[PDB]
């Protein structure tokens, strides 16, 4: 449920005894945890929301000029004053201009004048700030079993219902026991800080279009500043790059405005992530986090339930996911009550030889009603399959044949783990989460090493990191004393793998 | 930016009655709401700060409540000095607005 | 009014797709290729330059990258 | 006793500038944000702006951006409001009021408020009329 | 919408003053200086890189220029 | 005389958008809107799941597009070395106190 | 309250084009497939076609292929139906109705339906007559 | 498509009677069937979704049933507001058709 056909999902287990399943919660995929007990659970990060943003310096990219002024002065009488310049609403620059005979100025030679004009502007760039507090995570999770066609469509009553739950997380209130009447308590405690490395992030809204920007880049943009300001005529700062002054070969200086650079800041925005409904409530797309998840109290609701002997029937052609598993929605009337129902698979029967991954443990049916649809899934082994459902003779079976080999499973798992290794960096650790020694060792080694990788190879671009990896390779063959040339090979391969990022 | 409706528009009641005014805003104003009553040609009357708090010197004849977005003021017993236009107004986000008013009349 | 900061230098390595990556992870390539298609002889210019530095037959191509990659943008 | 007082009612030209004074009494003048709020004769109250008696800090709403100026006078403990480029809607009564924990120089409303949020010294009201 | 062609790569070497030279013959310098002021440790990054190429104590600074001059713009 | 070679538009406007979803396997989206060129359209593979119609599911496809209305044309005319015109003025010295254009 | 409303009855020329509006109320306009269904005065109901208020997706039956167009208007939450090349059978009453789980852009009937399948806002009926 | 016969063509009964209408289609319409009643010059009356489900606000005077291909609607007790033409219509395969009708008359 809720995590099928959402590829980039994962399945994580926990070696039973001391529920310690710290998942790397994803705002761009789902994660399903399983346990021999403790009905299998999913978690998917719906949205990310920020409550309060502060109004740091704004920017203007659309300006307008008027009431120009030159204020010529003789080659020797000082240089131009132009009382206009007195005001800051005007932008002015002072230029040495030629002044000859038949030009006034009984002398002649290089004189000077100060060309300038009013700086009126429009289309401000509200570059607000946000901080790791009064931001807000909002997730929804779903246990399997009941709830034919889970399917967020009618989520409203599903958080009121038992199979789905909606959770809000604050850096003030990190804990949340996702309580499911009859199912469990789903203990959760997360790190609402180290998700997106906030406090270096600004919420820019330009043309009612919002996004997040690494505040360093936002500080480095050379447009006019509102600079902190509030109401009152905006005294724009630096006021110069926008307008452009130009004299003739020697004389008569004028000014151009260079219009609006809206699309220019767009093409300069080539790394930000866009963001939506903003109100006093600013929502944004993906951003990960670390969530210690505990199966403290999850009762499976019907381990004692009988296996009512009605004949079961498929409805939809149980296609499989990229993760190899396969979901089926099986309907049946014929019996009543809160039923437990069998679901196994085999290679031969007259054995039924229950084999393979059972994901949707304790599949439960609610009521006496007609052919309830009983959505669930299982995962077959690498060969042909025989998924068996009903009970015995009036059961229903079906071929599968996963067609995914065991070494192939390791392939998909390791390339997935490697992509995690890349994008989550340190956080890719404790993903399969037991508090084991080598786990904290990996966390720490990546901590120091990748932090150095940041501070040394600061924000290496696509092309940059590409050629850096290439020349590191070329050098990894050249140098003697493999000790360091192997380190060249290592960093170069790290760079190239970083260039194998999601971009493909 | 903080549209706040103050219902009703007007009322008229006999002495010794309870009256209640509602104000709901389109925004979340958790506790930053206040209440006055003003005569024509008067500075308004001490009624309510924080939408739940009586000010010193105010008669206990008045009370205010409400948590999320909509808030209720109440006169316990009507009296001749209660003729005024009552106003509710928020304090947050600083385009500070008030209600247009709730007017009284004795019978 | 140089809108200097191409924000990609401050990427957010976060799961949701960023602002304009679609054209971005090709724009610099089309930059350099357009620029050199417009200024061809600069090829052998850079060649004669680099072939005179490094003196390795391996750093030579590195200085070729040097020159052909300062020319497009900072010009 | 904590109490504010305005200047007398005044009549001005359309497009002129009117300055209303607000003098304080009974408190340390540098401890209360002065809020100005307008009221047309038949209309309700609409907050104009705020000034801090200390340091002359200022802010307002967009309904007055470019016309409103608000200055301090620490000596006699007064605040002066100028409305510029007067307009037919300006015929109203304006109120000045002391407010809350005026610590440095601002509105400062994320922290607490109330306890006469701005309502102890609402003074008397400054009636202004704009015509010829 | 990368407005790719910074026309300075097609300068007109003609007597009248060109469009925006005033800020142009400083804009790339402010570019690189701003970028490095924002990403400092990349300094010693480039240092360790270049000090490992050329092996001349004279081409070393050349590869320093290489790295510190690919980093700003093409990023 | 200047001739009117290709013009450019940098200020556009969009309206009456259109998506035209299609199941994971029934071809890919048609969207009769796309028929016209006054509309600009691009065709994108989108996810299509259960509870989404389309009895199948997996990667389906739809063609998002909208009308391309625009303003502020860039008249980029052409000129040729003929029917251009130079105009100079010259002046001999001597007389004419304060020559002075 | 969930409710649809049509335009007034109209009379047109044979071979002309008639556009009937259908405005929604009480629900999020982008969550209900708008079905158009015809009814000749003495005849029963025959489903004309469907449009999605979101994205302007469309479909109909062959009895109207080439004459029927159906467009959205997200602003006022309306849907507009044009019948082209009007014909003597067109004198009827047409109905617009909200329908089911309008998730993306389609009819989408292999999944569930009902719960006012399309029957809560059947509006008032648009009487159209085609003659001279 | 989809041919669906709705029997009878017409009926007339006294107040307080039960009446039943049948509709059988040539196709399998497992549960995608619905029922209306419409006056001349009216939007129809809330009767039945899914051929077995009463809608909110509908009187319990009406009921619907049927599983495979043929389906029965029933008025438990006839009343003056029951004069209309009743319609049954399927939802599947999307050449959506209705019945021609079942007409009522009070005696
Ligand atoms: C639709 O909503 C109903 C409750 O009204 C719920 O039982 C059902 O599971 C929902 N279906 C989907 C696909 O969300």
């Amino acid at each position: 449920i809720r995590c099928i056909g959402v590829s980039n999902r994962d399945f994580v287990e926990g070696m039973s005894g001391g529920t310690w399943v710290d998942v790397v919660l994803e705002h761009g995929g789902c994660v399903t945890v399983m346990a021999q007990d403790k009905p299998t659970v999913d978690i998917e990060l719906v949205t990310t929301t920020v409550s309060n943003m502060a109004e740091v310096r704004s920017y203007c990219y659309e300006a307008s000029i008027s009431d120009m002024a030159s204020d010529s002065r003789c080659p020797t009488q000082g240089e131009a004053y132009l009382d206009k310049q007195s005001d800051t609403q005007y932008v002015c620059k002072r230029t040495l201009v030629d002044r000859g005979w038949g030009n006034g100025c009984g002398l002649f030679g290089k004189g000077s004048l100060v060309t300038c004009a009013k700086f009126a502007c429009s289309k401000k760039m509200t570059g607000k700030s946000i901080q790791p507090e009064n931001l807000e995570y909002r997730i929804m999770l779903s246990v399997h079993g009941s709830q034919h066609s889970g399917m967020i469509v009618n989520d409203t009553g599903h958080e009121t219902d038992e199979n789905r739950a909606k959770v809000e997380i604050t850096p003030n209130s990190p804990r949340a026991e996702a309580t499911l009447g009859g199912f469990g308590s789903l203990g959760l405690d997360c790190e609402p800080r180290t998700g997106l490395d906030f406090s270096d992030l600004y919420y820019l809204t330009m043309n009612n279009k919002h996004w997040l920007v690494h505040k360093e880049w936002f500080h480095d943009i050379p447009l006019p500043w509102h600079a902190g300001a509030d109401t009152g005529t905006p005294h724009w700062n630096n006021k110069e790059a926008l307008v452009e002054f130009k004299d003739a070969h020697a004389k008569r200086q004028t000014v151009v405005v260079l219009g609006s650079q809206e699309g220019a800041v767009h093409t300069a925005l080539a790394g930000a992530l866009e963001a939506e409904m903003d109100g006093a409530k600013g929502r944004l797309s993906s951003g990960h986090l670390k969530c210690r998840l505990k199966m403290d109290k999850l009762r499976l609701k019907g381990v004692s339930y009988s296996l009512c002997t009605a004949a079961f029937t498929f409805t939809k052609i149980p296609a499989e996911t990229l993760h190899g598993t396969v979901t089926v929605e099986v309907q049946y009337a014929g019996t009543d009550g809160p039923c437990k129902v069998p679901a196994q698979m085999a290679v031969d029967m007259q054995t039924l030889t229950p084999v393979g991954r059972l994901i949707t443990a304790n599949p439960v049916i609610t009521e006496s009603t007609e052919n309830s649809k009983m959505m669930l899934e299982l995962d077959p082994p690498f060969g042909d399959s025989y998924i068996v459902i009903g009970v015995g003779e009036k059961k229903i079976t079906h071929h599968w044949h996963r067609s995914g080999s065991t070494i192939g499973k390791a392939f998909e798992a390791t390339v997935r783990g490697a992509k995690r290794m890349a994008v989550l960096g340190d956080t890719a650790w404790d993903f399969g989460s037991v508090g084991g020694a080598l786990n904290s060792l990996g966390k720490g080694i990546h901590q120091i090493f990748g932090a150095a990788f940041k501070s040394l190879f600061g924000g290496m671009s696509w092309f940059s990191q590409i050629l850096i990896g290439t020349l590191l390779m070329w050098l990894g063959l050249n140098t003697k004393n493999g000790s360091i040339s192997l380190m060249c090979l290592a960093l170069g391969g790290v760079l190239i793998f970083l260039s194998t990022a999601v971009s493909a | 930016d903080i549209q706040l409706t103050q219902s009703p528009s007007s009322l008229s009641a006999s002495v010794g009655d309870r009256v209640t005014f509602t104000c709901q805003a389109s925004q979340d104003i958790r506790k930053y709401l206040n209440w006055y009553q003003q005569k024509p040609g008067k500075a308004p009357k001490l009624l309510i700060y924080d939408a739940s708090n009586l000010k010193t010197g105010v008669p206990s004849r008045f009370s205010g409540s409400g948590s999320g977005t909509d808030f209720t003021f109440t006169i316990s017993s009507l009296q001749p000095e209660d003729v005024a236009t009552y106003y509710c107004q928020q304090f947050d986000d600083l385009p500070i607005t008030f209600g247009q008013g709730t007017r009284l009349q004795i019978k | 009014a140089v809108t200097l900061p191409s924000h990609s230098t401050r990427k957010l390595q976060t799961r949701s797709q960023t602002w304009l990556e679609s054209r971005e992870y090709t724009k610099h390539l089309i930059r350099v290729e357009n620029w050199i298609f417009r200024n061809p002889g600069f090829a052998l210019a850079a060649a004669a330059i680099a072939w005179l530095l490094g003196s390795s037959t391996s750093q030579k191509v590195i200085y070729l990258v040097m020159i052909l990659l300062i020319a497009p943008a900072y010009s | 006793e904590v109490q504010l007082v305005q200047s007398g009612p005044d009549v001005e030209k359309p497009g002129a500038s009117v300055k209303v004074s607000c003098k304080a009494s009974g408190y340390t003048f540098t401890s209360n944000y002065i809020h100005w709020v307008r009221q047309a004769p038949g209309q309700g109250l609409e907050w104009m702006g705020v000034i801090n008696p200390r340091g002359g800090s200022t802010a307002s709403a967009q309904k007055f951006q470019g016309r409103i100026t608000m200055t301090r006078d620490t000596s006699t403990s007064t605040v002066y409001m100028e409305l510029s480029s007067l307009r037919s809607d300006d015929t109203a009564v304006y109120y000045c009021a002391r407010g809350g924990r005026a610590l440095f120089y601002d509105s400062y409303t994320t922290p607490r408020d109330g306890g006469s949020w701005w309502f102890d010294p609402w003074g008397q009201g400054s009636l202004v009329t704009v015509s010829s």
Side-chain angles (χ1 to χ4, degrees), chain A residues 1-78 80-135 137-366 368-504, chain B, chain C residues 1-30 32-75, chain D residues 1-103 108-132:
Chain A
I1 315 177
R2 182 167 180 72
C3 301
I4 51 175
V6 192
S7 96
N8 268 351
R9 95 178 287 180
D10 247 20
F11 313 100
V12 322
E13 27 107 315
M15 273 211 113
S16 184
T19 180
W20 183 256
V21 315
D22 206 325
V23 102
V24 180
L25 194 48
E26 226 135 312
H27 192 178
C30 182
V31 258
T32 305
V33 184
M34 304 60 46
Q36 302 73 37
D37 56 358
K38 292 283 202 174
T40 185
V41 28
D42 78 1
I43 181 58
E44 201 176 9
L45 204 138
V46 183
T47 177
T48 40
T49 61
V50 141
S51 72
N52 204 42
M53 353 12 76
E55 190 274 270
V56 16
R57 60 168 78 157
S58 336
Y59 282 100
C60 203
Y61 56 93
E62 178 132 30
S64 52
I65 52 189
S66 67
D67 65 4
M68 288 121 75
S70 53
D71 200 75
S72 107
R73 282 270 292 261
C74 286
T76 351
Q77 46 162 333
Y81 167 51
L82 190 48
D83 210 351
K84 282 261 200 224
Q85 151 178 42
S86 70
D87 219 62
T88 58
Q89 299 187 1
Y90 304 158
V91 59
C92 323
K93 196 217 53 151
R94 150 196 340 307
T95 338
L96 312 140
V97 129
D98 195 327
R99 300 292 311 278
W101 256 122
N103 194 19
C105 286
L107 258 126
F108 76 101
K110 283 296 309 220
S112 12
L113 59 88
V114 290
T115 308
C116 81
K118 175 163 194 164
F119 185 90
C121 109
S122 81
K123 287 203 169 46
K124 275 201 295 306
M125 289 183 184
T126 99
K128 306 195 175 70
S129 134
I130 67 167
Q131 67 278 21
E133 287 88 33
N134 63 54
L135 106 112
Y137 278 159
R138 172 201 278 100
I139 57 183
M140 297 189 86
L141 55 89
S142 292
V143 300
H144 286 171
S146 34
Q147 182 211 24
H148 78 287
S149 161
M151 303 317 134
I152 185 72
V153 189
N154 311 339
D155 52 357
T156 110
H158 279 91
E159 58 212 5
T160 312
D161 257 64
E162 288 304 331
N163 300 124
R164 306 200 50 256
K166 169 188 183 179
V167 166
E168 279 156 338
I169 302 194
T170 318
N172 194 1
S173 142
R175 283 92 54 80
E177 22 248 339
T179 154
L180 288 187
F183 272 84
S185 54
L186 233 87
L188 219 85
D189 58 302
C190 306
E191 289 166 352
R193 298 194 185 270
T194 70
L196 283 156
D197 336 356
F198 286 101
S199 100
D200 338 3
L201 261 161
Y202 284 164
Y203 192 98
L204 196 131
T205 289
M206 181 195 64
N207 196 2
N208 65 88
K209 269 314 191 177
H210 328 281
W211 46 83
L212 305 182
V213 290
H214 190 284
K215 63 171 299 223
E216 272 289 273
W217 166 99
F218 181 87
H219 258 183
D220 212 353
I221 179 167
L223 291 208
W225 279 336
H226 211 193
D230 15 67
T231 98
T233 274
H235 162 286
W236 290 98
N237 228 332
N238 228 3
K239 259 174 103 94
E240 229 218 18
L242 219 162
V243 299
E244 283 282 355
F245 279 3
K246 187 78 107 135
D247 53 313
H249 321 114
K251 46 157 194 292
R252 50 178 322 280
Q253 202 145 3
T254 176
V255 54
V256 295
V257 66
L258 259 71
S260 47
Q261 275 159 356
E262 188 259 335
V265 75
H266 270 91
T267 179
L269 219 109
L273 280 86
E274 88 190 292
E276 282 90 359
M277 179 15 234
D278 187 13
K281 250 312 128 26
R283 145 187 77 142
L284 28 104
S285 49
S286 120
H288 65 84
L289 77 155
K290 263 251 262 145
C291 282
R292 177 68 50 73
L293 174 39
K294 289 198 44 174
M295 291 340 126
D296 62 350
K297 263 261 141 149
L298 261 67
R299 305 191 145 319
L300 292 109
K301 202 159 178 344
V303 15
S304 43
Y305 284 177
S306 343
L307 17 124
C308 48
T309 295
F312 293 7
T313 68
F314 300 106
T315 69
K316 49 194 204 67
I317 338 272
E320 88 232 63
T321 110
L322 255 176
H323 313 75
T325 183
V326 50
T327 142
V328 53
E329 172 266 311
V330 52
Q331 81 172 27
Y332 78 94
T335 175
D336 301 328
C339 279
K340 219 216 269 227
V341 304
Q344 45 192 23
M345 69 178 72
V347 301
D348 73 330
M349 7 41 47
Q350 260 284 14
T351 37
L352 283 183
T353 177
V355 66
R357 230 32 140 143
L358 219 204
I359 293 34
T360 313
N362 62 304
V364 175
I365 293 290
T366 78
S368 313
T369 75
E370 58 165 353
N371 295 304
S372 312
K373 310 218 83 168
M374 188 51 128
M375 68 173 291
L376 54 96
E377 73 274 32
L378 298 88
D379 182 288
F382 50 91
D384 356 276
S385 256
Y386 274 137
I387 169 137
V388 16
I389 294 90
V391 259
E393 101 265 27
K394 287 127 175 140
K395 65 178 165 186
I396 192 54
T397 346
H398 182 201
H399 215 239
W400 196 234
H401 179 184
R402 179 184 179 88
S403 350
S405 309
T406 30
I407 303 207
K409 266 83 135 229
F411 217 125
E412 18 255 344
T414 188
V415 63
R416 203 163 301 99
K419 136 118 95 174
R420 301 192 253 107
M421 266 260 198
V423 330
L424 284 346
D426 308 36
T427 314
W429 296 108
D430 12 5
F431 186 58
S433 87
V434 295
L438 150 128
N439 290 318
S440 203
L441 213 130
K443 178 67 163 354
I445 184 177
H446 216 239
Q447 181 71 24
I448 338 256
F449 210 137
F453 184 49
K454 179 158 128 42
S455 218
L456 222 125
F457 282 65
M460 307 280 51
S461 77
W462 186 258
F463 203 62
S464 71
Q465 101 179 310
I466 290 203
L467 25 84
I468 304 260
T470 60
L471 324 187
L472 267 300
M473 294 297 57
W474 194 271
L475 287 255
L477 25 132
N478 212 70
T479 305
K480 70 219 154 98
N481 83 346
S483 181
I484 147 124
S485 49
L486 212 137
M487 105 81 70
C488 277
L489 266 168
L491 267 146
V494 175
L495 260 103
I496 302 201
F497 214 77
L498 256 297
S499 47
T500 40
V502 12
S503 219
Chain B
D1 174 288
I2 303 295
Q3 215 42 227
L4 166 87
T5 99
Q6 172 199 359
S7 35
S9 39
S10 261
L11 226 161
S12 96
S14 88
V15 107
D17 306 336
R18 140 150 46 135
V19 112
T20 179
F21 306 141
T22 298
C23 316
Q24 162 242 345
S26 26
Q27 245 65 25
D28 257 46
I29 286 94
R30 292 177 60 190
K31 271 332 265 264
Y32 309 125
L33 187 70
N34 314 69
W35 295 73
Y36 323 75
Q37 40 161 21
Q38 199 202 32
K39 242 191 132 137
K42 216 32 38 137
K45 281 109 234 328
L46 221 4
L47 294 203
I48 286 294
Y49 57 112
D50 301 61
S52 67
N53 271 326
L54 213 128
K55 188 62 178 178
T56 81
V58 187
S60 173
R61 290 228 325 313
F62 314 140
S63 204
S65 10
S67 171
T69 47
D70 92 61
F71 314 89
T72 78
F73 177 78
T74 145
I75 329 176
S76 249
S77 56
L78 220 128
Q79 297 289 3
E81 38 304 32
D82 306 344
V83 103
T85 304
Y86 283 57
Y87 292 96
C88 58
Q89 60 101 24
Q90 56 85 17
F91 202 87
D92 190 18
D93 225 339
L94 264 252
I96 303 124
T97 108
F98 300 45
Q100 335 320 345
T102 40
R103 208 171 332 115
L104 262 136
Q105 184 187 46
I106 22 173
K107 305 178 162 174
Chain C
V2 283
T3 176
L4 226 83
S6 327
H7 187 80
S8 114
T9 184
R10 285 301 174 172
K11 195 47 94 125
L12 283 74
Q13 54 189 1
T14 257
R15 177 65 56 89
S16 186
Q17 49 171 354
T18 183
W19 181 224
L20 304 197
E21 70 253 54
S22 339
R23 304 148 169 89
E24 156 256 295
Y25 80 122
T26 48
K27 58 151 167 156
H28 303 305
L29 180 78
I30 78 163
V32 301
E33 152 240 27
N34 264 319
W35 194 93
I36 64 164
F37 183 75
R38 301 300 185 179
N39 311 79
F42 187 71
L44 312 336
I49 292 152
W51 189 86
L52 287 193
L53 281 86
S55 104
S56 82
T57 77
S58 267
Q59 309 153 341
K60 302 285 202 75
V61 293
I62 310 264
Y63 280 128
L64 240 182
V65 174
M66 175 57 170
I67 304 311
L68 281 184
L69 272 302
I70 37 211
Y74 299 75
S75 140
Chain D
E1 196 33 295
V2 54
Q3 181 270 344
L4 268 183
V5 61
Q6 300 84 349
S7 104
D10 198 357
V11 179
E12 285 328 302
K13 297 158 91 164
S17 22
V18 32
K19 158 172 17 149
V20 178
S21 64
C22 188
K23 258 216 281 316
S25 49
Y27 70 64
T28 94
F29 183 60
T30 81
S31 168
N32 273 292
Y33 288 152
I34 306 309
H35 297 243
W36 281 109
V37 58
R38 61 170 335 173
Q39 192 163 30
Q43 272 75 344
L45 310 95
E46 289 93 290
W47 161 67
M48 222 195 273
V50 213
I51 183 180
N52 167 28
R54 209 181 315 153
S57 282
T58 183
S60 311
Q62 324 298 323
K63 283 183 21 163
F64 312 91
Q65 171 168 172
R67 298 144 98 189
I68 177 167
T69 66
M70 359 196 5
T71 60
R72 57 171 208 169
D73 199 65
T74 172
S75 77
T76 172
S77 134
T78 313
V79 293
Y80 291 83
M81 134 107 83
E82 284 148 357
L83 202 21
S84 161
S85 16
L86 268 55
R87 281 232 347 214
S88 334
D89 59 40
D90 288 342
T91 286
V93 23
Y94 304 140
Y95 280 105
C96 55
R98 101 178 167 89
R101 304 280 89 186
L103 265 71
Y108 282 162
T109 65
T110 309
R112 283 119 219 159
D113 53 323
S116 174
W117 55 107
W118 55 59
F119 186 63
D120 269 359
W122 267 47
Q124 292 111 291
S126 96
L127 180 64
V128 332
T129 304
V130 294
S131 289
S132 51

